[PDB]
Design a protein around this motif. Sequence first.
Motif, PDB file in Angstrom:
ATOM      1  N   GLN A 137       0.763  -0.780   0.227  1.00 36.28           N
ATOM      2  CA  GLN A 137      -0.235  -0.137  -0.295  1.00 36.28           C
ATOM      3  C   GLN A 137       0.523   0.902  -0.052  1.00 36.28           C
ATOM      4  O   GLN A 137       2.078   1.866   0.880  1.00 36.28           O
ATOM      5  N   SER A 138       0.627   1.913  -0.810  1.00 33.64           N
ATOM      6  CA  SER A 138       1.401   3.104  -1.262  1.00 33.64           C
ATOM      7  C   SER A 138       0.610   4.487  -0.994  1.00 33.64           C
ATOM      8  O   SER A 138       1.329   5.488  -2.262  1.00 33.64           O
ATOM      9  N   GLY A 139      -0.124   4.983  -1.280  1.00 29.54           N
ATOM     10  CA  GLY A 139      -1.026   5.898  -2.073  1.00 29.54           C
ATOM     11  C   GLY A 139      -2.074   6.105  -0.819  1.00 29.54           C
ATOM     12  O   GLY A 139      -2.679   4.756  -0.888  1.00 29.54           O
ATOM     13  N   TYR A 140      -3.691   6.780  -1.680  1.00 37.43           N
ATOM     14  CA  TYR A 140      -4.664   6.770  -2.237  1.00 37.43           C
ATOM     15  C   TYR A 140      -4.988   7.229  -3.465  1.00 37.43           C
ATOM     16  O   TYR A 140      -4.392   7.608  -4.115  1.00 37.43           O
TER      17      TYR A 140
ATOM     18  N   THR B  17      -4.446  12.059  -6.806  1.00 37.91           N
ATOM     19  CA  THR B  17      -3.833  11.322  -6.413  1.00 37.91           C
ATOM     20  C   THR B  17      -2.952  11.669  -5.380  1.00 37.91           C
ATOM     21  O   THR B  17      -2.106  12.602  -5.703  1.00 37.91           O
ATOM     22  N   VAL B  18      -2.354  10.649  -4.241  1.00 38.28           N
ATOM     23  CA  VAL B  18      -1.953  11.602  -2.598  1.00 38.28           C
ATOM     24  C   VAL B  18      -1.316  10.160  -2.353  1.00 38.28           C
ATOM     25  O   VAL B  18      -1.070   9.005  -2.648  1.00 38.28           O
ATOM     26  N   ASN B  19       0.032  10.707  -1.671  1.00 40.06           N
ATOM     27  CA  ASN B  19       0.613   9.547  -0.774  1.00 40.06           C
ATOM     28  C   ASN B  19       0.145   9.886   1.202  1.00 40.06           C
ATOM     29  O   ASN B  19      -0.015  10.273   1.206  1.00 40.06           O
ATOM     30  N   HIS B  20       1.458   8.766   1.748  1.00 37.42           N
ATOM     31  CA  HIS B  20       1.163   8.988   2.532  1.00 37.42           C
ATOM     32  C   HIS B  20       1.024  10.592   3.528  1.00 37.42           C
ATOM     33  O   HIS B  20       0.293  10.211   4.314  1.00 37.42           O
ATOM     34  N   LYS B  21       2.067  10.650   3.398  1.00 39.40           N
ATOM     35  CA  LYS B  21       1.787  12.136   4.277  1.00 39.40           C
ATOM     36  C   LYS B  21       0.710  13.161   3.494  1.00 39.40           C
ATOM     37  O   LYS B  21       0.866  14.594   3.382  1.00 39.40           O
ATOM     38  N   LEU B  22       0.060  13.074   2.510  1.00 40.52           N
ATOM     39  CA  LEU B  22      -1.022  13.555   1.052  1.00 40.52           C
ATOM     40  C   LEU B  22      -0.335  14.191   0.796  1.00 40.52           C
ATOM     41  O   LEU B  22      -0.149  16.131   1.129  1.00 40.52           O
ATOM     42  N   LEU B  23       0.821  14.475  -0.116  1.00 39.18           N
ATOM     43  CA  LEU B  23       1.001  15.263  -1.015  1.00 39.18           C
ATOM     44  C   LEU B  23       1.672  15.104  -2.485  1.00 39.18           C
ATOM     45  O   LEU B  23       0.798  13.567  -2.519  1.00 39.18           O
ATOM     46  N   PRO B  24       1.127  15.636  -3.265  1.00 39.40           N
ATOM     47  CA  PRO B  24       1.031  15.250  -4.838  1.00 39.40           C
ATOM     48  C   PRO B  24       2.146  13.858  -5.149  1.00 39.40           C
ATOM     49  O   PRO B  24       2.934  14.492  -4.811  1.00 39.40           O
ATOM     50  N   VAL B  25       1.576  13.181  -5.686  1.00 39.31           N
ATOM     51  CA  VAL B  25       2.665  12.440  -6.142  1.00 39.31           C
ATOM     52  C   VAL B  25       2.061  11.848  -7.976  1.00 39.31           C
ATOM     53  O   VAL B  25       0.699  12.369  -8.115  1.00 39.31           O
ATOM     54  N   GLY B  26       3.662  11.379  -8.384  1.00 38.31           N
ATOM     55  CA  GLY B  26       2.694  10.884 -10.120  1.00 38.31           C
ATOM     56  C   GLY B  26       2.982   9.390 -10.757  1.00 38.31           C
ATOM     57  O   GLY B  26       4.323   8.954 -10.580  1.00 38.31           O
ATOM     58  N   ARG B  27       1.772   8.537 -10.618  1.00 32.08           N
ATOM     59  CA  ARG B  27       2.088   7.455 -10.639  1.00 32.08           C
ATOM     60  C   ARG B  27       1.302   6.466 -12.349  1.00 32.08           C
ATOM     61  O   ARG B  27       0.390   7.201 -12.890  1.00 32.08           O
ATOM     62  N   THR B  28       1.169   5.602 -12.261  1.00 31.26           N
ATOM     63  CA  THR B  28      -0.380   4.585 -13.104  1.00 31.26           C
ATOM     64  C   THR B  28      -1.479   4.309 -12.426  1.00 31.26           C
ATOM     65  O   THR B  28      -0.838   3.758 -11.265  1.00 31.26           O
TER      66      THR B  28
ATOM     67  N   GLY C 129      -1.212  16.080 -10.256  1.00 33.14           N
ATOM     68  CA  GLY C 129      -2.208  14.777  -9.780  1.00 33.14           C
ATOM     69  C   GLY C 129      -3.621  14.899  -9.165  1.00 33.14           C
ATOM     70  O   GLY C 129      -3.813  15.090  -8.681  1.00 33.14           O
ATOM     71  N   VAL C 130      -4.107  16.184 -11.216  1.00 36.28           N
ATOM     72  CA  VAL C 130      -5.778  15.966 -11.115  1.00 36.28           C
ATOM     73  C   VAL C 130      -5.919  15.525 -12.181  1.00 36.28           C
ATOM     74  O   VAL C 130      -4.812  15.511 -13.113  1.00 36.28           O
ATOM     75  N   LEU C 131      -6.886  14.613 -12.143  1.00 36.81           N
ATOM     76  CA  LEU C 131      -7.319  13.540 -13.926  1.00 36.81           C
ATOM     77  C   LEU C 131      -8.285  13.743 -14.265  1.00 36.81           C
ATOM     78  O   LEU C 131      -9.079  13.380 -13.224  1.00 36.81           O
ATOM     79  N   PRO C 132      -8.505  14.834 -15.032  1.00 31.07           N
ATOM     80  CA  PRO C 132      -9.932  14.207 -15.514  1.00 31.07           C
ATOM     81  C   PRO C 132     -10.479  13.600 -16.667  1.00 31.07           C
ATOM     82  O   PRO C 132      -9.446  13.241 -17.538  1.00 31.07           O
ATOM     83  N   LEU C 133     -12.064  13.089 -16.612  1.00 32.82           N
ATOM     84  CA  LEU C 133     -11.912  12.024 -17.354  1.00 32.82           C
ATOM     85  C   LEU C 133     -13.485  12.512 -17.933  1.00 32.82           C
ATOM     86  O   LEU C 133     -13.862  13.773 -17.095  1.00 32.82           O
TER      87      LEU C 133
ATOM     88  N   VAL D  97      -7.765   8.958   6.149  1.00 27.80           N
ATOM     89  CA  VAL D  97      -5.680   8.373   6.314  1.00 27.80           C
ATOM     90  C   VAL D  97      -6.093   7.713   8.139  1.00 27.80           C
ATOM     91  O   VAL D  97      -5.130   7.334   8.143  1.00 27.80           O
ATOM     92  N   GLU D  98      -7.295   8.135   8.673  1.00 24.55           N
ATOM     93  CA  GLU D  98      -7.293   7.581  10.032  1.00 24.55           C
ATOM     94  C   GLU D  98      -7.470   6.149  10.249  1.00 24.55           C
ATOM     95  O   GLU D  98      -7.044   4.962  11.429  1.00 24.55           O
ATOM     96  N   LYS D  99      -8.426   5.693   9.531  1.00 24.32           N
ATOM     97  CA  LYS D  99      -8.807   4.026   9.410  1.00 24.32           C
ATOM     98  C   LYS D  99      -7.795   3.260   9.069  1.00 24.32           C
ATOM     99  O   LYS D  99      -7.836   2.180   9.352  1.00 24.32           O
ATOM    100  N   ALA D 100      -6.583   3.585   9.031  1.00 24.47           N
ATOM    101  CA  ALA D 100      -5.810   2.562   7.827  1.00 24.47           C
ATOM    102  C   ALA D 100      -4.470   2.473   9.149  1.00 24.47           C
ATOM    103  O   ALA D 100      -2.915   3.086   8.167  1.00 24.47           O
ATOM    104  N   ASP D 101      -4.209   3.131  10.440  1.00 20.25           N
ATOM    105  CA  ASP D 101      -2.654   2.842  11.057  1.00 20.25           C
ATOM    106  C   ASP D 101      -2.122   1.782  11.153  1.00 20.25           C
ATOM    107  O   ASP D 101      -2.666   0.928  10.561  1.00 20.25           O
ATOM    108  N   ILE D 102      -1.235   1.733  12.208  1.00 23.59           N
ATOM    109  CA  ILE D 102      -1.108   0.708  12.416  1.00 23.59           C
ATOM    110  C   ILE D 102      -0.932  -0.327  14.912  1.00 23.59           C
ATOM    111  O   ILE D 102      -1.583  -0.639  13.950  1.00 23.59           O
ATOM    112  N   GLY D 103      -0.869   0.487  14.959  1.00 21.51           N
ATOM    113  CA  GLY D 103      -0.877   0.197  16.506  1.00 21.51           C
ATOM    114  C   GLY D 103      -2.772   0.638  16.329  1.00 21.51           C
ATOM    115  O   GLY D 103      -2.392   1.342  17.041  1.00 21.51           O
ATOM    116  N   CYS D 104      -3.401  -0.271  16.826  1.00 21.26           N
ATOM    117  CA  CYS D 104      -5.036  -0.129  17.064  1.00 21.26           C
ATOM    118  C   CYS D 104      -5.347  -0.789  18.598  1.00 21.26           C
ATOM    119  O   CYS D 104      -6.046   0.570  18.994  1.00 21.26           O
ATOM    120  N   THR D 105      -3.864  -0.549  19.431  1.00 24.10           N
ATOM    121  CA  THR D 105      -4.421  -0.634  20.965  1.00 24.10           C
ATOM    122  C   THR D 105      -4.152   1.077  21.455  1.00 24.10           C
ATOM    123  O   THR D 105      -3.290   1.357  21.180  1.00 24.10           O
TER     124      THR D 105
END
Lengths: 629, 277, 305
Positions: free
Chosen positions: A94-97, A119-130, A155-159, A585-593
């Motif tokens: 998992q490498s973005g949103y 398209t954004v990454n873990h830190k919520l910054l623009p990225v470019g991928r496929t 990082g904006v795609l219109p269709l 972004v909050e629902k996908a953390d690591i430590g849940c306890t």
Amino acid sequence: SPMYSIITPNILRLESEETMVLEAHDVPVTVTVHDFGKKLVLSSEKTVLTPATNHMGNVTFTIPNREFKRNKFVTVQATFGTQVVEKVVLVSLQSGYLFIQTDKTIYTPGSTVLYRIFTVNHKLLPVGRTVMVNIENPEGIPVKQDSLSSQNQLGVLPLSWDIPELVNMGQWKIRAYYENSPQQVFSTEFEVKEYVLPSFEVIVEPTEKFYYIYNEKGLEVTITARFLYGKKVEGTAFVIFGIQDGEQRISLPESLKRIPIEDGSGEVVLSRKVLLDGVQNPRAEDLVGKSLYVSATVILHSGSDMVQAERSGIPIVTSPYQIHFTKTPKYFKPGMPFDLMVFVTNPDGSPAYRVPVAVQGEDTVQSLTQGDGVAKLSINTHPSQKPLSITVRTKKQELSEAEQATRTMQALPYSTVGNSNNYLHLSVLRTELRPGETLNVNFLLRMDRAHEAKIRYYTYLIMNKGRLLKAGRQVREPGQDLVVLPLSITTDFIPSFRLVAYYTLIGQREVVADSVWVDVKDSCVGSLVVKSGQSEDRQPVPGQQMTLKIEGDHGARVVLVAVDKGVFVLNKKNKLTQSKIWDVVEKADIGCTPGSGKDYAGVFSDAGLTFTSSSGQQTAQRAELQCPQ
Amino acid sequence: DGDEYFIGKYKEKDETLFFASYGLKRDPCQIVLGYKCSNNQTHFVLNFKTNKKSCISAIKLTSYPKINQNSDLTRNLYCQTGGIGTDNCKLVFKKRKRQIAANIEIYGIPAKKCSFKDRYIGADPLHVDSYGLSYQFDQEHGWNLERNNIFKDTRFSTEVFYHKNGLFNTQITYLAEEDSFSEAREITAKDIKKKFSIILPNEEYKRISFLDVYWFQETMRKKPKYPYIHYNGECSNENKTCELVFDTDELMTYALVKVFTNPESDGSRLKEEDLGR
Amino acid sequence: IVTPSGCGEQNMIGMTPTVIAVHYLDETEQWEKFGLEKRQGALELIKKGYTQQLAFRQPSSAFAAFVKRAPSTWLTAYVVKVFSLAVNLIAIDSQVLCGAVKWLILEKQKPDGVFQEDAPVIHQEMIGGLRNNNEKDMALTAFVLISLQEAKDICEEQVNSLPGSITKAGDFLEANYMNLQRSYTVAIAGYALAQMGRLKGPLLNKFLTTAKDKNRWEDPGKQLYNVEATSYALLALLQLKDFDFVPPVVRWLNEQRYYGGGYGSTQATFMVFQALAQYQKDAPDHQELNLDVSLQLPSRSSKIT
Ligand SMILES: *[C@@H]1O[C@H](CO)[C@@H](O[C@@H]2O[C@H](CO)[C@@H](O[C@@H]3O[C@H](CO)[C@@H](O)[C@H](O)[C@@H]3O)[C@H](O)[C@H]2NC(C)=O)[C@H](O)[C@H]1NC(C)=O
Ligand SMILES: *[C@@H]1O[C@H](CO)[C@@H](O)[C@H](O)[C@H]1NC(C)=O
């Protein structure tokens, strides 16, 4: 020379930047990453430790490759001049949103669909991928699929798509996912159904969200209808009630009423007798756990329109409150006081406000709740190692004693060796923290009572968004029992953070640790404001022109869309809002306890952190992807 | 049915790069998979550039409806920047007034270990060339004739340049009955320069008596510019290692040489009207 | 779970499960159940066993049961093969391995074309049911041929006589293929023979018909042959890419379901798990799918494909 320790994130994500904290407790050290058999070498870094800098290594590096197509591991090793320490960790994909926006909500055949993808990454910054996108019909078989790249677009795609003239009806879906990791998908829904645009809106509302079963006035609702451009309406309305059970609806034919709506105001009342006779349950207490709903229809005096509005989910309860224990540590503190944080909500889930709680066992130990509906309490320990049970009960005034919610919870002890038993917890009013404010982390401490004049310092780390934001070091002089950390809350801490601290003591080997969970206010770090730059003289006229004023941060892109407000009356689901972004972004953390595990390995491995020591005093490993349940 | 045009040779173990169908009267094209074209009254050009690591093997085009004209005496498909072996080239096709459709496919193979020697060498190198037409000689002198049913061109007198299916040809000298086949040599695209050379052995019974070259290339316009393949120095008996030097005006993408051996050759063999300036 | 510990042979029987687990958990990654939170400890035990194996080397550039034991062909060649599988996985001295292979070439090459190993086998716990010395010569010749094949990609240039020796062995054993009775050794020898492509036609017919009931390659005794026997053919059929008798191979593999490990588990288990590895890599749960459809209408001049 005595020891060397490594602190690492639990899971490292490929194509990103990660950190290690090295603590020698004038030496060059090097770190290296190898695959698991041995795929040549991935990366390596060199650093030196300086006594003037307290021997802290904040070693950062970027993790790369294409061969990484079940789950797989990777080995990280480090030689501190003469001795080597290594550990095996897991690698995820998992490498973005991906966020999807559509202009409208309901369409007709022959129209067109226009949407956008962010398209954004873990830190919520623009990225470019496929990315790849599929459109699915109600049955499930894809109709059209496509692949795209978002390079050099920020990082904006219109269709666009064009619905045919002879097409099916119902619900259609859009599913998008990255090309690298097809295991995770993101989805959006829209509707296809012929319609005609309405002309006014109808609102149905009760006076109380709940429904106490012991009231003689039944349930009362009010009806308010209004035109789209702001003027009032007249007409006649038909109202009916129902009963909702788990996937079941029952209609009461005896409860159907006609009322004249003048100036947009109507009143409907339902009595006990009709509700009791509608069902075959003379016993009232059997009705708890079943919900109510109401439906209304409004017609005009010119016989021109027809609007329907429905409100569903009026709960039937006997207690107008509710208690929760979602964010309370489960392992108590032998000797030192134990702190609890209760959670009180309205039956519909909305947080309560200004309601007192207490404990039946003790007296006068009470407090109130701020706007978040959270109250802070403290309790002393026996301190016998027998597990203890605590109970909580609402103590609101001006209410009968038989209508107070209550519940119970259990705690478990902490397994120390040699009875060091040292903890951490902040003695500050848990209030609405805001960015730009200040926090005072108060180390409430209790060392060994015999020779507590040997410990010199502590180590603390801040965890946020599954990464090490900051690592500090605070010292003290012998003979003290309280120290303070004046933290300065910045904008990067949103939406929550976890503080973990520890120290080391000479026995045999002693290490003691604890952790705390804190939350801050949620709002976007930037700022975007849209308003009317016009002089604001009077209401506009069709065909005129006006001026629109925007304010935002420098060097950004603003995208716009305008939609009629009559569409939202027909279908008002699946919109876009900042709360959705923070929830995702909050629902996908690591430590849940919440924290404070059973021992040092427990506390370190319950916050998505890994600690390795040169003496073999390490922590256990995990190889799954989500915490249980 | 429809007519067909080819580039290269097909093999039964190749995967498709892409596959599409095009109309030939719309303006402009329909952008398929983010590619670029251009369409005019007498031209249709396409730009291709793959992303995966692969080397192209063959191209094929099919046109409808059938028209009354043979498809081997002229050139209709050719790509201008690249070719076979390089991961991209820009296709160009010349239309007529009655063609209204096209189907296009491209095949390729993994980039690292891809070589084309196993196809164009054939199964019987002593009797059939790469084209498919078998050799046929003259019974009174034992010298091969010139195949006549293919697109052939000349620069000056006493020169020949054949073309078929995007593959050129040039025969250095004349061939005798009792020649033998020794081996074959191939040159890939990473060892191609504006000017280069190749070393061959001439030890005892490996005497070179015949060399024919096959190569793809690019053409800026419909009229090509054939490169100069001359024979450095003189390869007599004494100098054991003999070099072949190229001199190109445009960049190639592949080459293949089929050395022939005959111990009886004295090094000189020429026709009775080829000899004087 | 067999802990790799002891002398050279015990270390070998403890470390070939390491390699089969490495591949099987490269396809699955279930190292969790390899000791119940002992994967790092298991790997450390494997590494110390490998270090002990290295320490048991000899001045003759060979590995045996002990530093004093006379080196043999079979054990040294098997260790060479495993290290070749693990050259890029663990710390393997490639020069040492190639020198050992070249010493094997230059020392143990009988003029008769049949290779024999020096130290006789005493215990049957690792060899299997072939303690009887009747047709061991052909099996060991095939084993030496396999050693030459695996050294062909590692020590290609140092020794150039390999094609001649391979041709001589193939010519000698071409007429000897019709003088064998036991089926599993025929299967492994045919797998080696087809590894360079020398098994077709009537040879394949006699190969298949050697097995009982045309499917089960069993021999009197040693029931562990079952999940072993057809396994050979599978790899043989992996060389021929034939998946018609591989399904019956699979059916007969599943008919025993024997735990294994220890007695006779030195070549069968590795062979069956590597065969499973290439079977799953080349043949996933799905099969080949590739269709071309073309439809033509009487009112259009083109066809839709
Ligand atoms: C319809 O389009 C085709 C191409 O899609 C045109 O053919 C190409 O036209 C260009 C522009 O004239 C030619 O480029 C020219 O080449 C000269 C050669 O020295 C050079 O100086 C420049 O690069 C110049 O632009 C090109 O050669 C030609 N052929 C191709 C690309 O194969 C065609 O002319 C168009 N139709 C009409 C009526 O213009
Ligand atoms: C022929 O021999 C001469 C001797 O100097 C040498 O320069 C020349 O390159 C040779 N030619 C060939 C084709 O080998």
